[PDB]
DNA sequence: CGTGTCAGATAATCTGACACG
DNA sequence: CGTGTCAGATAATCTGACACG
């Protein structure tokens, strides 16, 4: 009942910039890097999931201390 | 721990049109009618809350059967 | 008395290439 | 090898007035 409401693509890239402190440039750099694949809009926007937002914070925490992308 | 994550204004009027079947014209008609007050963006957009989305469905159910606005 | 649709704005997001300590 | 910022597009949202069975 949890892996359905969260994994549903609901937010655009704006609100997720508010939750995190990540810049659209950071959040979209991780897309063409091979570790996050959020849904697309009818207008080719990016829908992020509630658990995908947690995944963008999984990276946020693995980057305030420091780490590359090939490692994660 | 529930009346904080929900009541936080997070969605714009687009995603809430997806959850409901309500048109932006309906969702914004209820604003200038005196029964819903969602937050504004820096760009003067409308942030809806997760419990505000429930309130827009409270109206959705009180309108498939039929009812005015002065009553609710 | 509730909602579709228009037309002209403004904010938000797209991809592409360039910049740099 | 990760991110700011640019410039020109397109989708998304604003307010205002008009339409109608």
Residue numbers in the entry:
A (entry chain A), B (entry chain A): 2 to 73
Study text:
In Gram-positive bacteria, nitrogen homeostasis is controlled by an operon encoding glutamine synthetase (GS), a dodecameric machine that assimilates ammonium into glutamine, and the GlnR repressor. GlnR detects nitrogen excess indirectly by binding glutamine-feedback-inhibited-GS (FBI-GS), which activates its transcription-repression function. GS generates glutamine from glutamate, ATP, and ammonium by a mechanism that involves the initial phosphorylation of the γ-carboxyl group of glutamate by ATP and the subsequent incorporation of ammonium. The structures show FBI-GS binds the GlnR C-terminal domain within its active-site cavity, juxtaposing two GlnR monomers to form a DNA-binding-competent GlnR dimer.
We next obtained structures of Sa GlnR and Lm GlnR bound to a 21 bp glnR consensus operator site to 2.35 and 3.45 Å, respectively, by X-ray crystallography. The GlnR structures are similar to each other and the Bs GlnR (rmsd = 0.6–0.8 Å for overlay of 67 corresponding Cα atoms). Residues 2–73 and 2–83 were visible for the Lm and Sa GlnR proteins respectively. The Lm and Sa GlnRs form comparable dimers to the Bs GlnR and dock on the DNA similarly. As observed in the Bs structure, both DNA sites bound by Sa and Lm GlnR are bent inward but the DNA from the Lm complex is slightly less bent (~21°) compared to the Sa and Bs structures (~25°). The GlnR DNA used for crystallization contains four conserved bps (bolded) in each half-site, 5′-CGTGTCAGATAATCTGACACG-3′ (where the consensus binding site is N1N2T3G4T5N6A7N(7)T7’N6’A5’C4’A3’N2’N1’; N indicates any nucleotide). These conserved bps are contacted in the major groove by Lm and Sa GlnR residues that are completely conserved among GlnRs; a conserved tyrosine (Sa Tyr32/Lm Tyr31) makes hydrophobic contacts to the DNA thymine3 (T3) methyl group, an arginine (Sa Arg28/Lm Arg27) specifically reads the G4 base and makes hydrophobic interactions with the methyl moiety of T5 and finally, the side chain methylene carbons of a conserved arginine (Sa Arg31/Lm Arg30) contacts the T7′ methyl group. However, GlnR proteins contain different wing residues, which our structures show make distinct contacts to the minor groove; wing residues Bs Arg46 and Sa Lys48 make nonspecific base contacts in the minor groove, but the corresponding Lm GlnR residue, His47, makes hydrophobic contacts to a ribose. The lack of minor groove base contacts by Lm GlnR may explain the slightly reduced DNA bend observed in this structure as the minor groove base contacts by Bs Arg46 and Sa Lys48 are facilitated by the more bent DNA conformation. The Sa GlnR dimer is generated by interacting N-terminal loops, while the Lm and the Bs N-terminal regions fold into distorted helices that interact. Nonetheless, all these interfaces bury significantly less surface area (~300–400 Å2 BSA) than the >2000 Å2 shielded by physiologically relevant dimers.
